[PDB]
Amino acid sequence: MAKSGIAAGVNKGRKTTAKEVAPKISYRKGASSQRTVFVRSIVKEVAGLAPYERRLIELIRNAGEKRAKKLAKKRLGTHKRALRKVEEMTQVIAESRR
Amino acid sequence: AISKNLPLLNNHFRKHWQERVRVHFDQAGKKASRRQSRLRKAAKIAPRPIDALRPVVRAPTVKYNRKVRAGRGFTLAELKAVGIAPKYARTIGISVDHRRQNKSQETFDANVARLQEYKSKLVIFDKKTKASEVASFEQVDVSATFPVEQPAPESGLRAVEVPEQTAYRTLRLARNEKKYKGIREKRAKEKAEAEAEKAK
Amino acid sequence: KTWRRWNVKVNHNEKRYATASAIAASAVTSLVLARGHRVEQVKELPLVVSNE
Amino acid sequence: KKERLTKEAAAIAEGKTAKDVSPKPVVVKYGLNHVVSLIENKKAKLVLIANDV
Amino acid sequence: GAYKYLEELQRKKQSDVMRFLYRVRCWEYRQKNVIHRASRPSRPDKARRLGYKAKQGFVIYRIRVRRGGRKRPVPKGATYGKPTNQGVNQLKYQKSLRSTAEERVGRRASNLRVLNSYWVNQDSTYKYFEVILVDPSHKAIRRDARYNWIVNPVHKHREARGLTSAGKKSRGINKGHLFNKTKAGRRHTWKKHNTLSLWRYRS
Amino acid sequence: PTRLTKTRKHRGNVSAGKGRIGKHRKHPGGRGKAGGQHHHRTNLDKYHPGYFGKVGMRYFHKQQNHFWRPEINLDKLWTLVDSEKKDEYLSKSSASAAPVIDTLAHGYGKVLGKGRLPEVPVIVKARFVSKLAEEKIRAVGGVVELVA
RNA sequence: GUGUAAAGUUCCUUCGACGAGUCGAGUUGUUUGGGAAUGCAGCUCUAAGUGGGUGGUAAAUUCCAUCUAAAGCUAAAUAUUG
RNA sequence: UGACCUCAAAUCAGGUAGGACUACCCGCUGAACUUAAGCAUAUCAAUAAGCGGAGGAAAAGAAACCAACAGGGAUUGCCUCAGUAGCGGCGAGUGAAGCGGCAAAAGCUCAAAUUUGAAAUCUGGCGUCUUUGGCGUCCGAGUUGUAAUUUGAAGAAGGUAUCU
């Protein structure tokens, strides 16, 4: 079935008849909504950009993706959050070239 | 300080342990008063049973997979199957657990049958119910009336079917496959791009 | 100190051994007399009386 | 509001719905949450914002 | 509602607008007393999140707390002990400045119950907090089924016992394997683990 | 009982059995395992070899439930058969109908192959078997069924 | 009893707001069984929206499982040289 | 001449806090003797003394949990795990948790939603009654948000078949 039926190897365990589960509503926590997107775009218009966000955009403008990634990781702290930050800055530039 | 052929001991008594010695002289008194509390609680709510009905669940881990024990509450799906709202179910002696889900069908079916057995014996009083009818009932023990029972282990006689490959060989092959799955996948993949890029 | 050992564990089967041995001894007249009972005017042991 | 409530009590006593006796109000919408919701639903026609909040 | 906009804007603390507002408000708060009464929350949305309601009996106090660590208050730095205990500088207080702010405000307004607190501003020397307090003798609190709980005497100076959010954070009251020593109180767990439990029939 | 101890017999004799020269003192030699490498080395070397040092790799957060696998040998495998049907099973068993022994339901992890079996087909259910144990089972006409 | 009330129960569609100087990161100190760092605290940096946390060896790449933090209340089983 | 905001005063109307006790409880702060046959890390000990805060219990508590299973399911305690994984001049020492058996079992509340065809909410004064309060009325609070509705286990707005 979904288990190998023996006590060792890949996908080990006892076979059972899987029952379909309706996903919990709490699992939808990270989902975005129309309300939060609309509000977040308005606040971005009002707030502007942080000093480090402005500096990042210039590095991306100067073809310094490797430079921009290191600054973002120094600022934000982790590599995963830096990768997302550098991207939304690339989208910001892409939406200001027109 | 170290003499003769003796085991080396770990006696953790270098703190002020004599200030934290708890002697259970009150074990018998606690037993008696626990029984008195139990009696008072039972007599307050009679003939309604003192225990809520509990489900039956599989014990977690590889060591306790075999055993089956009493759970905390019937899942919302199990109560859905017997048509009892959880808010209502809490009021008629059926325990509810919003946290548990049913990935399998065996536990779900066992708990559904348990709920049906309970619901069959349930008699719900009302305003029209009089003192004589209520008096004709006895306070049962729900846990003993619906005990958690281990499924019967396999016994008896069966036909013998001998596969060609031994069980030991099967286990050895499963171990080897699991051990080298990643390296074989990496090798096969890189060979795939090697033979799909230079053959373009 | 109060954490001196006060109670003693006895194996349950050994305790039952002793109970059975004492019950058996209750039917020996020499043992009942040695124990100190005035059983010289009881005809036989054990002494069994009707359920009334 | 008390006078309108008395009139609507008389109307509901005589068996009308208390909606058919009083005309629909046309008033100034105030309150920050209420007015923001009105703006987001494109229902407001004019907004006046204080300069000293 | 505007609370969503307020909540999202307060997260842009390095924007020009919020930087300007923080400059102005930091100066203004630094001019007033260390503890003073605020007529209204300077962050109404944040106050709503923490349980504040615009009712009579809810009070807001702004307080100013000094930043940095805790120098060991020994005369001339002499500790009279073993060299592992000779440290005087680079020592840290085990409660956050948020807890200190709540405790001092609760001491000043002794007839109120500290409900919660939040961060409002910051400079080099001070952190600024706003503390939400409740009057338990006001009838609008005593007749409110959603806040009657704080009238019970077990909540006397809950901030002095670490029962506020900041205090429970500093006590390590959380679930899981990362909080094994402090799930049910550090000292209670220690006492449980350092107790010799002897029964009548010793095993 | 204090009355059977030698303290009651040492009454009247000066040193209480501790000697006049040695003079029973507080802690000559140190407390606990003091000096295990200096003046108690001659004891630790003689009676507890291997005491000092590290061997092997650490195992952070070792959960012993993973390593649960109680053994049962083949000479004891027929005890898991129901006692009252053992004699009947031992006589009529054949490849068409052999007793089934679920070792897992009795709390065993691995079947090992020590001993000899009755010359009777059996169907053994185990999580694990050794190589020799399964050879012996098939030699009497049985089989091993792997379960999980 | 003001029950043309409230509450629940089936299915469909569209939605479904969910807590920021916080999470997280570095460093310092203390603490822990927690060991390339268990918690706590100071300082500096400082988020996101299927995002975030955890999965006891640091890092990158790819998955999986499991919860939903930064707001709050709650008896009993437990302690008790007053 | 008036509102508003902020800040005051009053022997203003009515309230509230402090202090005592110490066995248990919640925090902070914090040693050294001692052990290591010396001693500095360590140990004693996250203890004593010191400070702050309670109750009849307190705390914790309805998962940003444990797991890796065929999965369990708030918190607490016991038995066990276990003198174990681990930590440690890897020396002296120290040292938990998951599972399992049991005792007791109980679950929930806000913020974030436009009532918008009507601030529907609340303190106080005054009057009255049958007074742990009810009713009426007048100021006041409150739109920088008091009620009703929802809390992720969901739920909302429409539509739906009737039932309970």
Side-chain angles (χ1 to χ4, degrees), chain B residues 15-16 58 60-61 65 69 72 90 98-99:
Chain B
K15 314 189 194 179
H16 287 72
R58 282 272 157 197
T61 223
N65 273 324
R69 54 159 176 91
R72 196 182 204 273
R90 282 191 191 93
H98 64 274
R99 278 174 293 260

mmCIF file of all heavy atoms in Angstrom, chain B residues 15-16 58 60-61 65 69 72 90 98-99, chain H residues 46 63 68-69 72-74 100 107-108:
data_model
loop_
_atom_site.group_PDB
_atom_site.id
_atom_site.type_symbol
_atom_site.label_atom_id
_atom_site.label_comp_id
_atom_site.label_asym_id
_atom_site.label_seq_id
_atom_site.Cartn_x
_atom_site.Cartn_y
_atom_site.Cartn_z
ATOM 1 N N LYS B 15 24.061 17.180 48.007
ATOM 2 C CA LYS B 15 23.316 18.384 48.315
ATOM 3 C C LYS B 15 22.608 18.214 49.653
ATOM 4 O O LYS B 15 22.697 17.175 50.305
ATOM 5 C CB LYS B 15 22.323 18.703 47.204
ATOM 6 C CG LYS B 15 22.884 18.616 45.812
ATOM 7 C CD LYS B 15 21.878 19.158 44.829
ATOM 8 C CE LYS B 15 22.219 18.798 43.406
ATOM 9 N NZ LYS B 15 21.191 19.316 42.485
ATOM 10 N N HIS B 16 21.887 19.250 50.073
ATOM 11 C CA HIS B 16 21.132 19.212 51.321
ATOM 12 C C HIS B 16 19.859 18.386 51.144
ATOM 13 O O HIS B 16 18.739 18.871 51.271
ATOM 14 C CB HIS B 16 20.812 20.624 51.782
ATOM 15 C CG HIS B 16 21.993 21.363 52.323
ATOM 16 N ND1 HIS B 16 23.008 21.832 51.522
ATOM 17 C CD2 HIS B 16 22.314 21.723 53.585
ATOM 18 C CE1 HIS B 16 23.908 22.444 52.268
ATOM 19 N NE2 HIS B 16 23.510 22.393 53.524
ATOM 20 N N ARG B 58 -4.116 3.756 19.057
ATOM 21 C CA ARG B 58 -2.841 3.052 19.014
ATOM 22 C C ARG B 58 -1.782 3.810 19.799
ATOM 23 O O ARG B 58 -1.659 5.030 19.683
ATOM 24 C CB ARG B 58 -2.374 2.884 17.573
ATOM 25 C CG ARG B 58 -3.054 1.782 16.804
ATOM 26 C CD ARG B 58 -2.349 0.469 16.998
ATOM 27 N NE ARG B 58 -3.239 -0.651 16.738
ATOM 28 C CZ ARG B 58 -3.003 -1.891 17.133
ATOM 29 N NH1 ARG B 58 -1.918 -2.200 17.817
ATOM 30 N NH2 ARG B 58 -3.884 -2.841 16.847
ATOM 31 N N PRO B 60 1.781 5.277 20.497
ATOM 32 C CA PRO B 60 2.824 5.663 19.550
ATOM 33 C C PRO B 60 4.149 4.936 19.817
ATOM 34 O O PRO B 60 4.278 4.338 20.868
ATOM 35 C CB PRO B 60 2.968 7.165 19.813
ATOM 36 C CG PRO B 60 2.638 7.306 21.273
ATOM 37 C CD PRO B 60 1.540 6.293 21.517
ATOM 38 N N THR B 61 5.060 5.009 18.837
ATOM 39 C CA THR B 61 6.431 4.414 18.796
ATOM 40 C C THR B 61 6.404 2.945 18.350
ATOM 41 O O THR B 61 5.352 2.304 18.420
ATOM 42 C CB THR B 61 7.320 4.762 20.003
ATOM 43 O OG1 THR B 61 8.625 5.071 19.521
ATOM 44 C CG2 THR B 61 7.416 3.639 21.012
ATOM 45 N N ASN B 65 3.635 -0.154 19.294
ATOM 46 C CA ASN B 65 2.678 -0.256 18.198
ATOM 47 C C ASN B 65 1.633 -1.321 18.473
ATOM 48 O O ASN B 65 0.460 -1.160 18.127
ATOM 49 C CB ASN B 65 3.404 -0.583 16.896
ATOM 50 C CG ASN B 65 3.884 0.638 16.182
ATOM 51 O OD1 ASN B 65 3.221 1.666 16.190
ATOM 52 N ND2 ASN B 65 5.031 0.535 15.541
ATOM 53 N N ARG B 69 -4.834 1.394 23.547
ATOM 54 C CA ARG B 69 -5.196 1.918 24.858
ATOM 55 C C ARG B 69 -6.331 2.918 24.712
ATOM 56 O O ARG B 69 -6.846 3.145 23.620
ATOM 57 C CB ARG B 69 -3.990 2.555 25.551
ATOM 58 C CG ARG B 69 -3.302 3.603 24.731
ATOM 59 C CD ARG B 69 -2.492 4.518 25.599
ATOM 60 N NE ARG B 69 -1.754 5.484 24.800
ATOM 61 C CZ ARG B 69 -2.208 6.681 24.466
ATOM 62 N NH1 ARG B 69 -3.389 7.105 24.870
ATOM 63 N NH2 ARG B 69 -1.457 7.469 23.708
ATOM 64 N N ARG B 72 -8.110 10.144 24.437
ATOM 65 C CA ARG B 72 -8.662 11.301 25.125
ATOM 66 C C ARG B 72 -10.077 11.638 24.686
ATOM 67 O O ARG B 72 -10.945 11.848 25.534
ATOM 68 C CB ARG B 72 -7.778 12.525 24.913
ATOM 69 C CG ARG B 72 -8.089 13.614 25.887
ATOM 70 C CD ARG B 72 -7.256 14.833 25.665
ATOM 71 N NE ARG B 72 -7.169 15.603 26.895
ATOM 72 C CZ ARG B 72 -8.044 16.523 27.264
ATOM 73 N NH1 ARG B 72 -9.047 16.874 26.481
ATOM 74 N NH2 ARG B 72 -7.909 17.103 28.449
ATOM 75 N N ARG B 90 -20.335 16.624 24.344
ATOM 76 C CA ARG B 90 -19.731 16.845 25.652
ATOM 77 C C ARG B 90 -20.750 16.804 26.780
ATOM 78 O O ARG B 90 -20.368 16.582 27.932
ATOM 79 C CB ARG B 90 -18.997 18.179 25.679
ATOM 80 C CG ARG B 90 -17.655 18.147 24.999
ATOM 81 C CD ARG B 90 -16.878 19.404 25.296
ATOM 82 N NE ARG B 90 -15.695 19.519 24.455
ATOM 83 C CZ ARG B 90 -15.662 20.174 23.305
ATOM 84 N NH1 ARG B 90 -16.737 20.768 22.817
ATOM 85 N NH2 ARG B 90 -14.520 20.237 22.627
ATOM 86 N N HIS B 98 -10.504 17.648 19.627
ATOM 87 C CA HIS B 98 -10.374 18.376 18.376
ATOM 88 C C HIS B 98 -9.004 18.203 17.741
ATOM 89 O O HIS B 98 -8.826 18.566 16.576
ATOM 90 C CB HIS B 98 -10.638 19.856 18.617
ATOM 91 C CG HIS B 98 -9.635 20.504 19.518
ATOM 92 N ND1 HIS B 98 -9.753 20.498 20.889
ATOM 93 C CD2 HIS B 98 -8.494 21.174 19.242
ATOM 94 C CE1 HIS B 98 -8.729 21.140 21.419
ATOM 95 N NE2 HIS B 98 -7.951 21.560 20.441
ATOM 96 N N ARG B 99 -8.034 17.672 18.475
ATOM 97 C CA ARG B 99 -6.669 17.601 17.981
ATOM 98 C C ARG B 99 -6.399 16.336 17.180
ATOM 99 O O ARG B 99 -5.587 16.360 16.254
ATOM 100 C CB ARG B 99 -5.685 17.700 19.148
ATOM 101 C CG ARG B 99 -5.408 19.112 19.606
ATOM 102 C CD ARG B 99 -4.560 19.137 20.852
ATOM 103 N NE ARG B 99 -5.272 18.581 21.991
ATOM 104 C CZ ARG B 99 -5.866 19.303 22.930
ATOM 105 N NH1 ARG B 99 -5.812 20.622 22.924
ATOM 106 N NH2 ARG B 99 -6.538 18.687 23.893
ATOM 107 P P A H 46 21.944 22.743 41.372
ATOM 108 O OP1 A H 46 21.132 21.932 42.296
ATOM 109 O OP2 A H 46 22.749 22.080 40.334
ATOM 110 O "O5'" A H 46 20.992 23.784 40.647
ATOM 111 C "C5'" A H 46 20.179 24.675 41.395
ATOM 112 C "C4'" A H 46 20.693 26.087 41.314
ATOM 113 O "O4'" A H 46 21.114 26.371 39.961
ATOM 114 C "C3'" A H 46 19.692 27.182 41.631
ATOM 115 O "O3'" A H 46 19.556 27.400 43.026
ATOM 116 C "C2'" A H 46 20.258 28.384 40.887
ATOM 117 O "O2'" A H 46 21.293 28.992 41.640
ATOM 118 C "C1'" A H 46 20.889 27.726 39.660
ATOM 119 N N9 A H 46 20.045 27.806 38.457
ATOM 120 C C8 A H 46 19.385 26.784 37.839
ATOM 121 N N7 A H 46 18.726 27.149 36.779
ATOM 122 C C5 A H 46 18.979 28.501 36.686
ATOM 123 C C6 A H 46 18.563 29.471 35.768
ATOM 124 N N6 A H 46 17.776 29.210 34.728
ATOM 125 N N1 A H 46 18.992 30.729 35.956
ATOM 126 C C2 A H 46 19.785 30.984 36.997
ATOM 127 N N3 A H 46 20.240 30.160 37.927
ATOM 128 C C4 A H 46 19.792 28.919 37.710
ATOM 129 P P A H 63 -5.274 24.117 21.882
ATOM 130 O OP1 A H 63 -5.643 25.483 21.451
ATOM 131 O OP2 A H 63 -5.657 22.977 21.031
ATOM 132 O "O5'" A H 63 -3.704 24.057 22.117
ATOM 133 C "C5'" A H 63 -2.808 24.872 21.375
ATOM 134 C "C4'" A H 63 -1.418 24.815 21.950
ATOM 135 O "O4'" A H 63 -1.119 23.446 22.317
ATOM 136 C "C3'" A H 63 -0.308 25.242 21.007
ATOM 137 O "O3'" A H 63 0.781 25.737 21.781
ATOM 138 C "C2'" A H 63 0.094 23.919 20.372
ATOM 139 O "O2'" A H 63 1.390 23.908 19.819
ATOM 140 C "C1'" A H 63 -0.020 22.976 21.561
ATOM 141 N N9 A H 63 -0.315 21.589 21.218
ATOM 142 C C8 A H 63 -0.740 21.046 20.042
ATOM 143 N N7 A H 63 -0.931 19.759 20.112
ATOM 144 C C5 A H 63 -0.619 19.442 21.419
ATOM 145 C C6 A H 63 -0.610 18.244 22.140
ATOM 146 N N6 A H 63 -0.945 17.072 21.624
ATOM 147 N N1 A H 63 -0.242 18.283 23.432
ATOM 148 C C2 A H 63 0.099 19.454 23.958
ATOM 149 N N3 A H 63 0.129 20.644 23.386
ATOM 150 C C4 A H 63 -0.243 20.563 22.105
ATOM 151 P P A H 68 10.156 8.421 17.632
ATOM 152 O OP1 A H 68 10.326 7.272 18.544
ATOM 153 O OP2 A H 68 11.246 9.404 17.484
ATOM 154 O "O5'" A H 68 9.807 7.851 16.196
ATOM 155 C "C5'" A H 68 8.473 7.482 15.880
ATOM 156 C "C4'" A H 68 8.174 7.690 14.422
ATOM 157 O "O4'" A H 68 8.012 9.107 14.153
ATOM 158 C "C3'" A H 68 9.250 7.191 13.462
ATOM 159 O "O3'" A H 68 8.630 6.656 12.302
ATOM 160 C "C2'" A H 68 9.991 8.468 13.092
ATOM 161 O "O2'" A H 68 10.652 8.426 11.848
ATOM 162 C "C1'" A H 68 8.859 9.484 13.092
ATOM 163 N N9 A H 68 9.312 10.856 13.303
ATOM 164 C C8 A H 68 9.961 11.374 14.386
ATOM 165 N N7 A H 68 10.254 12.637 14.263
ATOM 166 C C5 A H 68 9.764 12.971 13.016
ATOM 167 C C6 A H 68 9.758 14.169 12.296
ATOM 168 N N6 A H 68 10.280 15.303 12.750
ATOM 169 N N1 A H 68 9.197 14.165 11.076
ATOM 170 C C2 A H 68 8.673 13.026 10.630
ATOM 171 N N3 A H 68 8.617 11.837 11.208
ATOM 172 C C4 A H 68 9.187 11.882 12.413
ATOM 173 P P C H 69 8.775 5.100 11.963
ATOM 174 O OP1 C H 69 9.944 4.576 12.699
ATOM 175 O OP2 C H 69 8.691 4.969 10.493
ATOM 176 O "O5'" C H 69 7.462 4.445 12.571
ATOM 177 C "C5'" C H 69 7.488 3.701 13.779
ATOM 178 C "C4'" C H 69 6.117 3.647 14.395
ATOM 179 O "O4'" C H 69 5.894 4.857 15.149
ATOM 180 C "C3'" C H 69 4.974 3.603 13.400
ATOM 181 O "O3'" C H 69 4.690 2.290 12.958
ATOM 182 C "C2'" C H 69 3.823 4.269 14.149
ATOM 183 O "O2'" C H 69 3.152 3.348 14.989
ATOM 184 C "C1'" C H 69 4.556 5.277 15.028
ATOM 185 N N1 C H 69 4.552 6.636 14.454
ATOM 186 C C2 C H 69 4.722 7.684 15.343
ATOM 187 O O2 C H 69 4.882 7.421 16.536
ATOM 188 N N3 C H 69 4.737 8.945 14.883
ATOM 189 C C4 C H 69 4.566 9.166 13.590
ATOM 190 N N4 C H 69 4.577 10.423 13.173
ATOM 191 C C5 C H 69 4.377 8.118 12.656
ATOM 192 C C6 C H 69 4.373 6.876 13.128
ATOM 193 P P G H 72 -3.506 7.414 16.975
ATOM 194 O OP1 G H 72 -4.685 6.528 17.002
ATOM 195 O OP2 G H 72 -3.649 8.797 16.484
ATOM 196 O "O5'" G H 72 -2.893 7.447 18.437
ATOM 197 C "C5'" G H 72 -3.326 8.387 19.400
ATOM 198 C "C4'" G H 72 -2.187 8.804 20.286
ATOM 199 O "O4'" G H 72 -1.086 9.216 19.455
ATOM 200 C "C3'" G H 72 -2.463 9.995 21.183
ATOM 201 O "O3'" G H 72 -3.034 9.604 22.413
ATOM 202 C "C2'" G H 72 -1.098 10.640 21.355
ATOM 203 O "O2'" G H 72 -0.383 10.031 22.414
ATOM 204 C "C1'" G H 72 -0.406 10.288 20.047
ATOM 205 N N9 G H 72 -0.327 11.392 19.080
ATOM 206 C C8 G H 72 -0.645 11.313 17.758
ATOM 207 N N7 G H 72 -0.432 12.416 17.118
ATOM 208 C C5 G H 72 0.078 13.268 18.075
ATOM 209 C C6 G H 72 0.499 14.607 17.971
ATOM 210 O O6 G H 72 0.502 15.333 16.981
ATOM 211 N N1 G H 72 0.943 15.092 19.183
ATOM 212 C C2 G H 72 0.985 14.388 20.343
ATOM 213 N N2 G H 72 1.444 15.015 21.423
ATOM 214 N N3 G H 72 0.600 13.142 20.450
ATOM 215 C C4 G H 72 0.162 12.649 19.287
ATOM 216 P P G H 73 -4.389 10.266 22.932
ATOM 217 O OP1 G H 73 -4.684 9.701 24.261
ATOM 218 O OP2 G H 73 -5.379 10.214 21.842
ATOM 219 O "O5'" G H 73 -4.016 11.788 23.151
ATOM 220 C "C5'" G H 73 -2.979 12.184 24.039
ATOM 221 C "C4'" G H 73 -2.660 13.645 23.866
ATOM 222 O "O4'" G H 73 -2.245 13.864 22.496
ATOM 223 C "C3'" G H 73 -3.833 14.588 24.100
ATOM 224 O "O3'" G H 73 -3.327 15.845 24.533
ATOM 225 C "C2'" G H 73 -4.406 14.743 22.703
ATOM 226 O "O2'" G H 73 -5.178 15.908 22.508
ATOM 227 C "C1'" G H 73 -3.138 14.756 21.864
ATOM 228 N N9 G H 73 -3.332 14.305 20.487
ATOM 229 C C8 G H 73 -3.865 13.125 20.061
ATOM 230 N N7 G H 73 -3.898 13.028 18.770
ATOM 231 C C5 G H 73 -3.353 14.218 18.323
ATOM 232 C C6 G H 73 -3.121 14.699 17.017
ATOM 233 O O6 G H 73 -3.361 14.155 15.944
ATOM 234 N N1 G H 73 -2.544 15.955 17.021
ATOM 235 C C2 G H 73 -2.228 16.662 18.143
ATOM 236 N N2 G H 73 -1.676 17.865 17.967
ATOM 237 N N3 G H 73 -2.437 16.225 19.362
ATOM 238 C C4 G H 73 -2.997 15.010 19.374
ATOM 239 P P A H 74 -3.183 16.185 26.090
ATOM 240 O OP1 A H 74 -1.757 16.102 26.477
ATOM 241 O OP2 A H 74 -4.178 15.406 26.845
ATOM 242 O "O5'" A H 74 -3.633 17.699 26.161
ATOM 243 C "C5'" A H 74 -3.109 18.658 25.260
ATOM 244 C "C4'" A H 74 -2.973 19.994 25.931
ATOM 245 O "O4'" A H 74 -4.290 20.481 26.288
ATOM 246 C "C3'" A H 74 -2.211 19.981 27.244
ATOM 247 O "O3'" A H 74 -0.809 20.047 27.059
ATOM 248 C "C2'" A H 74 -2.789 21.179 27.970
ATOM 249 O "O2'" A H 74 -2.241 22.380 27.457
ATOM 250 C "C1'" A H 74 -4.250 21.108 27.546
ATOM 251 N N9 A H 74 -5.045 20.294 28.476
ATOM 252 C C8 A H 74 -5.596 19.077 28.216
ATOM 253 N N7 A H 74 -6.245 18.569 29.221
ATOM 254 C C5 A H 74 -6.111 19.519 30.211
ATOM 255 C C6 A H 74 -6.577 19.573 31.524
ATOM 256 N N6 A H 74 -7.301 18.616 32.094
ATOM 257 N N1 A H 74 -6.273 20.661 32.243
ATOM 258 C C2 A H 74 -5.545 21.622 31.676
ATOM 259 N N3 A H 74 -5.052 21.684 30.452
ATOM 260 C C4 A H 74 -5.376 20.587 29.766
ATOM 261 P P G H 100 2.127 6.492 25.393
ATOM 262 O OP1 G H 100 1.010 6.158 24.503
ATOM 263 O OP2 G H 100 2.094 7.719 26.201
ATOM 264 O "O5'" G H 100 2.281 5.277 26.393
ATOM 265 C "C5'" G H 100 2.406 3.951 25.919
ATOM 266 C "C4'" G H 100 2.806 3.022 27.031
ATOM 267 O "O4'" G H 100 4.093 3.417 27.562
ATOM 268 C "C3'" G H 100 1.903 3.025 28.244
ATOM 269 O "O3'" G H 100 0.734 2.254 28.061
ATOM 270 C "C2'" G H 100 2.821 2.500 29.332
ATOM 271 O "O2'" G H 100 2.986 1.100 29.202
ATOM 272 C "C1'" G H 100 4.137 3.163 28.948
ATOM 273 N N9 G H 100 4.354 4.439 29.649
ATOM 274 C C8 G H 100 4.411 5.673 29.070
ATOM 275 N N7 G H 100 4.628 6.630 29.915
ATOM 276 C C5 G H 100 4.725 5.989 31.131
ATOM 277 C C6 G H 100 4.954 6.519 32.419
ATOM 278 O O6 G H 100 5.122 7.694 32.744
ATOM 279 N N1 G H 100 4.975 5.530 33.378
ATOM 280 C C2 G H 100 4.797 4.202 33.128
ATOM 281 N N2 G H 100 4.852 3.384 34.175
ATOM 282 N N3 G H 100 4.588 3.695 31.936
ATOM 283 C C4 G H 100 4.563 4.639 30.985
ATOM 284 P P G H 107 -12.048 18.866 27.677
ATOM 285 O OP1 G H 107 -13.162 17.911 27.541
ATOM 286 O OP2 G H 107 -10.719 18.444 27.191
ATOM 287 O "O5'" G H 107 -12.410 20.224 26.927
ATOM 288 C "C5'" G H 107 -13.756 20.639 26.758
ATOM 289 C "C4'" G H 107 -14.087 21.898 27.526
ATOM 290 O "O4'" G H 107 -12.994 22.299 28.387
ATOM 291 C "C3'" G H 107 -14.357 23.148 26.712
ATOM 292 O "O3'" G H 107 -15.614 23.155 26.069
ATOM 293 C "C2'" G H 107 -14.205 24.239 27.757
ATOM 294 O "O2'" G H 107 -15.341 24.275 28.602
ATOM 295 C "C1'" G H 107 -13.028 23.703 28.567
ATOM 296 N N9 G H 107 -11.762 24.292 28.109
ATOM 297 C C8 G H 107 -10.896 23.785 27.189
ATOM 298 N N7 G H 107 -9.876 24.559 26.986
ATOM 299 C C5 G H 107 -10.080 25.642 27.819
ATOM 300 C C6 G H 107 -9.304 26.804 28.029
ATOM 301 O O6 G H 107 -8.236 27.120 27.513
ATOM 302 N N1 G H 107 -9.883 27.649 28.952
ATOM 303 C C2 G H 107 -11.057 27.410 29.596
ATOM 304 N N2 G H 107 -11.467 28.340 30.456
ATOM 305 N N3 G H 107 -11.790 26.335 29.408
ATOM 306 C C4 G H 107 -11.246 25.496 28.512
ATOM 307 P P C H 108 -15.762 23.862 24.639
ATOM 308 O OP1 C H 108 -17.056 23.459 24.051
ATOM 309 O OP2 C H 108 -14.509 23.634 23.888
ATOM 310 O "O5'" C H 108 -15.830 25.413 24.976
ATOM 311 C "C5'" C H 108 -14.841 26.309 24.491
ATOM 312 C "C4'" C H 108 -14.542 27.383 25.503
ATOM 313 O "O4'" C H 108 -13.257 27.134 26.125
ATOM 314 C "C3'" C H 108 -14.416 28.800 24.976
ATOM 315 O "O3'" C H 108 -15.663 29.423 24.735
ATOM 316 C "C2'" C H 108 -13.611 29.476 26.070
ATOM 317 O "O2'" C H 108 -14.436 29.768 27.187
ATOM 318 C "C1'" C H 108 -12.651 28.360 26.471
ATOM 319 N N1 C H 108 -11.346 28.463 25.783
ATOM 320 C C2 C H 108 -10.524 29.545 26.070
ATOM 321 O O2 C H 108 -10.922 30.381 26.883
ATOM 322 N N3 C H 108 -9.327 29.653 25.467
ATOM 323 C C4 C H 108 -8.940 28.725 24.607
ATOM 324 N N4 C H 108 -7.749 28.872 24.033
ATOM 325 C C5 C H 108 -9.756 27.606 24.296
ATOM 326 C C6 C H 108 -10.937 27.510 24.907
#
